[PDB]
Write a protein that binds this ligand. Structure first.
Ligand code: CL
Ligand code: CL
Ligand code: CL
Ligand code: CL
Ligand code: CL
Ligand code: CL
Ligand code: CL
Ligand code: CL
Ligand code: CL
Ligand code: CL
Ligand code: CL
Ligand code: CL
Ligand code: CL
Ligand code: CL
Ligand code: CL
Ligand code: CL
Ligand code: CL
Ligand code: CL
Ligand code: CL
Ligand code: CL
Ligand code: CL
Ligand code: FE
Ligand code: FE
Ligand code: FE
Ligand code: FE
Ligand code: FE
Ligand code: FE
Ligand code: FE
Ligand code: FE
Ligand code: FE
Ligand code: FE
Ligand code: FE
Ligand code: FE
Ligand code: FE
Ligand code: FE
Ligand code: MG
Ligand code: MG
Ligand code: MG
Ligand code: MG
Ligand code: MG
Ligand code: MG
Ligand code: MG
Ligand code: MG
Ligand code: MG
Ligand code: MG
Ligand code: MG
Ligand code: MG
Ligand code: MG
Ligand code: MG
Ligand code: MG
Ligand code: MG
Ligand code: MG
Ligand code: MG
Ligand code: MG
Ligand code: MG
Ligand code: MG
Ligand code: MG
Ligand code: MG
Ligand code: MG
Ligand code: MG
Lengths: 167, 167, 167, 167, 167, 167, 167
């Protein structure tokens, strides 16, 4: 009922994007536990983000079931890098990822609005759009502090941020 | 130390296979919560399996870090089906998946043995090989009961199994 | 005192028979946990019976010591089958076993009576004869329900009995 | 999977040997509660060993089921003696029994290694090989103390050992 | 009802025998607290036996009342010795006493059986015959340990038995 | 049983090496509590490592006893330095020590494998090989952070590491 | 301040002697857990002594740091024997060791007195001299009881001492 085929397909694309985001954060988490990086609170922070993205994907999969759509899964692409370079660079990449996921969600909302699907609009507003705003804000805060502190080249910056903000 | 490049690569392949298994089980979980399947304990059972496979993948990623190897992630391929057909068919597919993952782990163990890597052999024996045996046994039990009960065509079989064994 | 050599020997034969019964039930327990049988409550039920028969044997061994007799152990023969065929067939075999053990106990009681051994008669009446009656009754109940339900050929019967009576 | 027929048969032989060990210890337990031996802590010690051997047998029976093998039970032979002669002699016989069971387990491990069965090797290493080493050590300790104390001919030795080490 | 005069008289004889046994054990208890014996746990052990025999006598007196018989008390004869010689000798005398009391109870049971008095037979089987078997076994155990330890001439034997088995 | 003389000797050499490692860490602990070093959490960290190495030595001494080998102790050589120079240098020396101890353990495992001693192989895999991997990883993490922070010449680096990672 | 170079060197010699004493007691502890000695409370007693000597060494190392001295470690020599012969012989060797350590401490006190170092004198009096007196007294008590009991040749003596004084 009131579930447009374009919306079903767009939900499936968003599911894949959320799973991709989860994979990016998983990669980041295990980069920070390398013996040549060893920033354990950066690691835990990104692991927590990874698990949150899996929950984001699952809520959309539940939505598809609830609305009578058909979940169509696609390959989860590997992240763009295996070496994330530094705490600052990972934070900057996460910030860009969240902005890109946000743009996809806003396009999905525009599609739902065009199709007159208020249930889908409310779902996105309730569980996704403000979560994205908060995440983009948090990551921007972290990027700003790391830059001001002199990361990645100032030897104390990422260590101090790991042990005081993320710990 | 004592970490052969062939082993590093084989660990990365096993990481990908564990993530694939997690994805298969996630797909199965959300198949069973469709409005035309609606077997909620099959759904929860496979969701729990999915989360266990993610843990399997993470332990190998930790092993790579601990040994000084480099994690190299690859695309997580989508599962072979989106429509898993029945509770019995999903159980049979899970059984085959676990046997295939087991064969990969036994090949990894043979490689570790050939390279004289007792730490890697013990890691596989401690966390993987018996887990696989138990999982293959459990799934075989479930397949047998579903077949004997008359699944998928006997209308009460999958429902009764959902509500008594998996619930 | 008042302990006839025929009674000493008959007690030793009964010890062996109780140990045999324990072995039969152990075999049954592990038949029901095969991956092609997988009736876990049948398995637990027969395992509990096995442990009870070991206790039956030990009480007779204690009796021999208390009365000044000499325990003389013999081989414990393997059970008649390794494949118990079905839940119904195992229950029917257990019923026959308990009737046979009961007949042996009643012959032992008749011998004790003939030898004027009231301590031995009371021992059998107190710990064995009513236990056997209760066990034969319980197994007869189980056989009747399984037969009426359509076991072994009705696919739901043994499963439902496992999950509702024995569970 | 990866379960060699020679291994299936060797597991069945080991099951029988563990059940035999349990029977030997049961015989010993009830020897020590004779009115002409009356060493109640020797009795309890060997009864506890008997129950441990039954658990050893059951774990192998479970392994057979888990791996898809077929349990094939054989007669449990009676112990070599019904009169165990003394506390020292029983301890010496138990020590020899455990060494013989250990040799059988090491042959089983060598077979599993030859067949490339790391799951079976790990199973034996995890639950059997160190248990055997500890048991052989404990029994050797007990034999040494009993010999030094003058057992069986020094009238106080077995009594004092019963009441201070085993009690 | 169904209470034969021969049984009434035999119950009265058994009452007297139980009271005699209580007196023997009282004498033994106070022998072991002499300043030239001073085995306080032998003393407590026999005092406990004395009190148990008084209970045995009282239960028969209650039986007489319950059945409508007439209690006819007789002198309680003094024990055969006032000097019980040693811990071993007292244990051996207690063993003989319990065997003699057992023979009297078995004769009483035979009389009750001949008179068709199942209530009296059951009373003896329930409260007397197995108690006697257990007591004869316990005393035989104690005699055996004391003999093997070298009592009464080995200076440490009775002391060690007092402080470890009876204490 | 199955305990090769070469293995007995190699175990004794490993005992000595573990005791040496304990001594190195004890020296390091008391270097960091000098009035001209005064890094109390470096001190506590290395003291904890010292106590862990003593436990490593004791477990091998117990193994020798359990297997019937003869412990043969040798002088514990003093550490290579009394002045450990800096927090970074001590961490780098500890890392090299643990790699050297690891290589000795892997040689011991290879010897045990060659001699067909699965109990010894499992002992090393269970209690030593993964402990070494974890320790080498931890020390590598610490070295990396100290280097990146600018230790030993950056005046705040070792102090901050002491007070945030090791405290 | 007021810390003479002769005192610094003598403290370093005493550190080494305390570590040697700890090693002697460690050797003794593991002698008593051999399968041909098996005196578990002798073993625990000497293990506790070993740990106490390590604490004695550490307190002197702390003293060196507190006073601004330089700890200079030396090899810890192996104990004089690996086979300690008997419980009595080990106790006699421990008694001689403690007397020798006491003489070294009294020489250290005489040196501190000659150098006008009341802090060092008080340190020795507070933590070492009375501890040594108590230890020499305790070991003398143990030697006396073992000798009087007939150790090592009286088969019950060391066993009884293990189970009553040290247990
Ligand atoms: Cl908000
Ligand atoms: Cl921030
Ligand atoms: Cl900086
Ligand atoms: Cl298991
Ligand atoms: Cl099942
Ligand atoms: Cl149906
Ligand atoms: Cl009833
Ligand atoms: Cl029923
Ligand atoms: Cl049916
Ligand atoms: Cl152990
Ligand atoms: Cl012992
Ligand atoms: Cl003796
Ligand atoms: Cl009883
Ligand atoms: Cl006794
Ligand atoms: Cl004596
Ligand atoms: Cl780990
Ligand atoms: Cl770190
Ligand atoms: Cl700085
Ligand atoms: Cl004092
Ligand atoms: Cl003492
Ligand atoms: Cl002696
Ligand atoms: Fe998201
Ligand atoms: Fe996000
Ligand atoms: Fe897995
Ligand atoms: Fe799996
Ligand atoms: Fe029975
Ligand atoms: Fe039965
Ligand atoms: Fe066993
Ligand atoms: Fe055993
Ligand atoms: Fe009585
Ligand atoms: Fe009595
Ligand atoms: Fe170590
Ligand atoms: Fe280490
Ligand atoms: Fe000391
Ligand atoms: Fe000392
Ligand atoms: Mg960190
Ligand atoms: Mg690609
Ligand atoms: Mg709106
Ligand atoms: Mg809203
Ligand atoms: Mg977020
Ligand atoms: Mg349902
Ligand atoms: Mg594809
Ligand atoms: Mg292992
Ligand atoms: Mg699993
Ligand atoms: Mg079931
Ligand atoms: Mg046969
Ligand atoms: Mg029964
Ligand atoms: Mg006893
Ligand atoms: Mg035979
Ligand atoms: Mg054992
Ligand atoms: Mg006394
Ligand atoms: Mg008279
Ligand atoms: Mg009694
Ligand atoms: Mg500090
Ligand atoms: Mg040197
Ligand atoms: Mg191995
Ligand atoms: Mg470590
Ligand atoms: Mg002992
Ligand atoms: Mg030397
Ligand atoms: Mg002391």
């Amino acid at each position: 009922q009131n579930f447009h085929p374009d919306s079903e397909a767009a939900i499936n694309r968003q599911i894949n994007l959320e799973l991709y985001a989860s994979y990016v954060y998983l990669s980041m988490a295990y980069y920070f536990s390398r013996d040549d990086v060893a920033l354990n609170n950066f690691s835990r922070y990104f692991l927590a983000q990874s698990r949150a993205e899996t929950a984001h994907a699952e809520k959309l999969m539940r939505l598809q079931n609830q609305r009578g759509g058909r979940i169509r899964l696609q390959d989860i692409k590997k992240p763009e890098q295996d070496d994330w370079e530094s705490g600052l660079h990972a934070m900057e990449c996460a910030l860009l990822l969240e902005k890109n996921v946000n743009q996809s969600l806003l396009e999905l909302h525009a599609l739902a609005s065009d199709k007159g699907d208020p249930h889908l609009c409310d779902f996105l507003e309730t569980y996704y759009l403000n979560e994205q705003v908060k995440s983009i804000k948090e990551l921007g805060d972290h990027v700003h502090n790391l830059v001001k502190m002199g990361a990645p080249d100032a030897g104390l910056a990422e260590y101090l941020f790991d042990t005081h903000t993320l710990g």
